[PDB]
Amino acid sequence: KLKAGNFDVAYQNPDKAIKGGNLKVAYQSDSPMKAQWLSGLSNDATFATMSGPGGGQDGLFFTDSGFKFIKGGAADVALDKESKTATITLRKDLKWSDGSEVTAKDYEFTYETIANPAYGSDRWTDSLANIVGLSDYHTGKAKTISGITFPDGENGKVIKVQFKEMKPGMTQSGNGYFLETVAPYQYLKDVAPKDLASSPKTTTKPLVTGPFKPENVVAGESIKYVPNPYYWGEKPKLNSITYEVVSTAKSVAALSSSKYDIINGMVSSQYKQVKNLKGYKVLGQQAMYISLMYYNLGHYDAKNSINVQDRKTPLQDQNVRQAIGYARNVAEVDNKFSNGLSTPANSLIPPIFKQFTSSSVKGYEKQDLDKANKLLDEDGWKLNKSTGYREKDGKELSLVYAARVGDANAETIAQNYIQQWKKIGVKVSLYNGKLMEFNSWVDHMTTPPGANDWDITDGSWSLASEPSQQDLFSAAAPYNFGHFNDSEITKDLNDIDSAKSENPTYRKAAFVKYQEDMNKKAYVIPTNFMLNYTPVNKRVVGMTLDYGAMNTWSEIGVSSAKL
């Protein structure tokens, strides 16, 4: 029995919030915190979440619950179809936490932190190539970005962005075609680009725009947030918020002891323990999330920003990629371990995207060992009965699986897949014989040109809030970890965001074709959709998961003091 969104998104607390209070929040992470306050230089969900009280890496725009931009946040955005432009207007009273002004240059500077390769960002995308002049800036052909202009100068509040083509997602946060954050140029301008990611000024001592500012950061561990007096909006109720990492093994005990009021990111396997805690209300919602299995198919040319699908491997054969997908027992694993919160995915577009997900698309959600065996046969991988593995030209079908650390069942689940692959005559071993630590895995995946010492890996994403996956899979994106490059897929991705896709009927058809083609080519295999849950101590007032709730850090409080 899969649980449905029949969780509550809000804890509607009838007790009044006090003036002051010290809220304690944790993110479940077995890896150390990676503090990076600049959105362009940060790749991980853990810190993006922990940065929330500080403004979420200085996000600019408010949205509704469907992620559509609305007016009244730190900035407004207006589109003009026929000029092919966006105009971003920063609030007159938008300030940094040192009291300095947020200006137009701070918005343009975000684009430089990603597009100028001297900063070492991993967030270049083909989506950004759609801004006039930005590709030429990115390659060093131009020293400025011609498509970004300032109607009232660099120290004004207005920025105009010129596009090559408009994209249907532009009405929605997470679209990727224009950026949504500011970076404090006056604070950071003297830091050499290569040094910016490791500077105290982007790690332990940042400037921020949110309702709280990080008074202290303990590297790898925690943030002490206090109210930011220069915040333009609603003054917070709380005196402080501490935000800390907590290990998977210590999470449940930290709720029993009231150490944390809220823990974010808790694994499906712990839900049975958490649901029984009388001092807590458990909130939940469909996760803006996908997990997937990647195949290593090439390398990344960083100088020229292109994934090159040139790796010599049996995984270049579609039948082999498909077989390895069909062999997994994802449903069996989810049924045993996930407490009904993980559902085997049929495609890469998760159910939260209700219009553009396709429930009738068939993927690898059902194990089919017979089909897997047939595919390998027909591709010439014949079973050596003496060994129980398949061969070609005396070469064994042997692969390396870079499985990751996780919860108490991670090694068991990885081994369960290795055993399923043995049933289809594929020999699979763990990378260096053990599960990979997360921060190490991220480095291994993102560092150009890519490694050649793995074949299969698992990734999972806190997805951008607009369903287009250009920024996961486009030919120029370092986030395409397996480095596939396929003209059919590139056309599919582009068609989803075409002018014709301003019509939602046409865009739906485009999303369906993309979902089908990705499953057929099998460069990646969708793994799981999830429901997320969040325990909240009963003393917390004004907590809600509603995606349309824009002022929660200012509104949230406590009804009694912590012991």
Binding site: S29, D30, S31, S39, S42, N43, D44, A45, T46, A48, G56, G59, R123, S173, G174, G176, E180, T181, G265, V267, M288, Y289, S291, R404, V405, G406, D407, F438, V442, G459, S460, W461, S462, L463, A464, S465, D471, L472, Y479
Partner: peptide, 9 residues
């Protein structure tokens, strides 16, 4: 979220 971010699980 406003961007794609890598999750530990």
């Amino acid at each position: 979220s406003l961007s794609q971010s890598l999750s530990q699980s």
